[PDB]
Amino acid sequence: SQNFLFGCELKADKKEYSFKVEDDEHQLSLRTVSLGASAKDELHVVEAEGINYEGKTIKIALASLKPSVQPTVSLGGFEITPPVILRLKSGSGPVYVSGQHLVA
Amino acid sequence: SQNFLFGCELKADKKEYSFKVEDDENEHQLSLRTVSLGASAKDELHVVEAEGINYEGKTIKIALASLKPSVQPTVSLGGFEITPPVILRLKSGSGPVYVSGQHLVAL
Amino acid sequence: SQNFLFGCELKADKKEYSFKVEDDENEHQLSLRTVSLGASAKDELHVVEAEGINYEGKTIKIALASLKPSVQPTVSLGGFEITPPVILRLKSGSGPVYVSGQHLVALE
Amino acid sequence: SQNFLFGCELKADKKEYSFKVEDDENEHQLSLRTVSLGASAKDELHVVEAEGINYEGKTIKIALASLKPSVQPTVSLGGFEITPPVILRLKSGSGPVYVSGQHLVA
Amino acid sequence: SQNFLFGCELKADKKEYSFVEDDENEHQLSLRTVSLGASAKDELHVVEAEGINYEGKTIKIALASLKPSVQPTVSLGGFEITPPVILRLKSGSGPVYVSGQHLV
Numbered sequence: 001s002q003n004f005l006f007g008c009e010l011k012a013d014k015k016e017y018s019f020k021v022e023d024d025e026h027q028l029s030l031r032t033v034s035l036g037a038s039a040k041d042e043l044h045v046v047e048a049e050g051i052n053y054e055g056k057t058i059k060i061a062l063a064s065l066k067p068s069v070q071p072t073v074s075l076g077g078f079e080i081t082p083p084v085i086l087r088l089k090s091g092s093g094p095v096y097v098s099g100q101h102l103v104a
Numbered sequence: 105s106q107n108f109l110f111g112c113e114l115k116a117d118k119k120e121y122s123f124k125v126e127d128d129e130n131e132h133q134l135s136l137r138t139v140s141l142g143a144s145a146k147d148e149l150h151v152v153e154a155e156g157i158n159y160e161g162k163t164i165k166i167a168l169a170s171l172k173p174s175v176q177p178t179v180s181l182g183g184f185e186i187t188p189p190v191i192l193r194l195k196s197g198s199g200p201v202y203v204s205g206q207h208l209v210a211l
Numbered sequence: 212s213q214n215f216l217f218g219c220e221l222k223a224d225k226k227e228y229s230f231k232v233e234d235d236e237n238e239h240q241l242s243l244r245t246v247s248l249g250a251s252a253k254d255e256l257h258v259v260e261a262e263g264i265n266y267e268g269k270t271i272k273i274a275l276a277s278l279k280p281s282v283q284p285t286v287s288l289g290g291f292e293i294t295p296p297v298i299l300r301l302k303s304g305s306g307p308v309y310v311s312g313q314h315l316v317a318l319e
Numbered sequence: 320s321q322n323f324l325f326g327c328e329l330k331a332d333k334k335e336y337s338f339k340v341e342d343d344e345n346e347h348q349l350s351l352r353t354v355s356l357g358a359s360a361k362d363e364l365h366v367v368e369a370e371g372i373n374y375e376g377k378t379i380k381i382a383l384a385s386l387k388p389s390v391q392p393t394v395s396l397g398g399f400e401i402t403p404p405v406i407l408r409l410k411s412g413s414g415p416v417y418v419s420g421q422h423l424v425a
Numbered sequence: 426s427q428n429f430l431f432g433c434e435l436k437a438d439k440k441e442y443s444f445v446e447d448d449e450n451e452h453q454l455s456l457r458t459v460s461l462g463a464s465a466k467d468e469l470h471v472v473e474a475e476g477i478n479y480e481g482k483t484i485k486i487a488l489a490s491l492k493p494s495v496q497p498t499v500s501l502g503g504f505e506i507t508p509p510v511i512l513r514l515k516s517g518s519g520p521v522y523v524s525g526q527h528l529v
Contacts, residue, residue, distance in 0.1 A: 003453075003507055004479040007486030027107070031504045034490040037469040037516060043143040043177060053108040053207040060111025061202030064140040064177040071469070071490040076182040076289065076397060076502035078137045079107055079206065090143045096487035100505070101479045133214065149250050149284075159215040159232070159239075159314045166218030167309035170247040170284040182289040182397070182502065184244045185313060187214045196250060240322075256358040256392060266323040266340075266347075266422045273326025274417030277355040277392040289397045289502065291352045292421060294322050303358045348428070364463055364497065371430040374527045381432025382522035385460040385497040397502040399457045400526060402428050411463050 001104035011093035036094035044091030115199030136184040142200035150197030221301040243291040249307035257304025263297035330414035339404040351399040357415035365412030436519030455526040460498040462520035470517030476510040
């Protein structure tokens with residue numbers, strides 16, 4: 001309903017970003033995943049970790065990106081319910097993630 | 105309507121994922137968000153298909169994406185919604201290929 | 212609404228796919244999601260178009276996507292909603308070219 | 320709500336497409352889905368622009384897409400909704416360039 | 426609601442575009458594409474957006490990385506942002522264009 005900016009940066013020496021919220025309805029809406037200019041020229045895979053419909057945590061790949069092929073990927077508003085961790089699975093980074101934090 | 109994370113991995117010795125739901129209180133849809141190749145995938149075509157019914161009850165196979173590490177390692181589908189049951193199948197390539205989405209649940 | 216899979220394959224020997232549904236009291240809609248190149252597509256530009264009626268009632272042709280195996284083998288359309296009748300046509304390129312999406316049927 | 324096909328072709332000899340509607344009862348919206356290069360387009364950057372009024376009433380030009388046949392021959396907009404009137408224009412490149420979407424009438 | 430065109434141009438010169446109106450109405454920018462103009466140099470450009478998170482802290486988020494020879498346009502799919510927001514060309518020459526909707 002209300003909407004605010006969200007972002008994070010993943011790199012080899014900080015690979016994880018933990019999205020959680022203190023109880024007060026929230027979604028994280030992912031929009032883009034992009035590589036910074038100094039990312040190495042190799043495939044970077046970013047993954048999300050969160051609850052499936054049977055209440056178990058799963059790890060899913062969100063994007064695979066390479067500077068010389070495909071530096072940005074737009075997700076078009078992929079909504080996830082917190083808690084979620086974003087994780088860098090390969091490549092040096094930096095990788096950036098943008099989106100919205102939604103609050104209803 | 106509620107929303108839960110969905111993913112599966114397809115590869116050489118595991119080419120299919122069967123998305124099925126039991127009858128519970130709810131209407132279910134699988135919303136596909138991305139298809140992505142993993143970093144160990146061979147530099148060749150990968151084709152990912154969906155298998156489910158058309159509007160006349162016939163089972164059809166439809167091509168979701170053609171991907172290749174050096175050209176286009178990821179495609180974002182934008183929320184391709186599919187009523188269960190559906191099989192997602194690595195029709196061609198070694199993989200690994202990851203498919204991510206949401207499992208949407210509504211009364 | 213009900214939601215079903217839609218696909219077609221457009222090729223040299225079958226350039227057109229005609230999307231038409233039997234008379235019924237339901238409203239029908241195609242939501243195009245992807246277009247993609249088959250394995251055996253020549254490395255060249257392939258263009259898929261749609262042919263159907265515009266607001267004025269006139270039959271028009273519109274270019275949906277241009278793809279090439281070594282540049283961009285898949286194009287997501289993100290839910291390009293079209294009201295049947297429509298013909299999808301390989302306008303150039305050898306193919307094969309696949310088109311995927313959803314076929315939506317709502318109640319009256 | 321009614322949904323019709325929309326498209327236009329922009330090229331060296333026809334650089335502009337002017338979209339306008341006259342309707343005192345129903346609202347119209349042009350929902351742009353893709354921009355794509357034709358098969359004979361020169362392998363160079365192509366820019367496609369729209370021209371239309373902003374919130375303050377000033378007519379403005381915005382860039383919709385930059386495409387190039389050997390790099391990114393199609394750009395998907397996702398349903399970029401525009402209130403008529405609007406001009407679509409090929410700012411630079413040979414073309415031909417195609418714009419496709421939906422004409423929606425409520 | 427009402428729906429108007431929006432756009433701006435970002436360049437090494439004027440790196441910034443600034444998007445409240447004092448108004449009785451709610452305003453949203455929906456960002457559609459980010460694209461590199463004809464004379465932009467063949468290098469990595471990064472566009473960022475600056476605005477509050479849901480805690481009202483000012484944050485900066487990477488919207489897109491683009492390069493003429495690899496991905497000259499990124500489509501964001503309607504990334505709705507509530508004003509004030511600054512859009513800025515964190516790196517590269519430009520010109521970089523942003524296009525979208527101003528909804529009221």
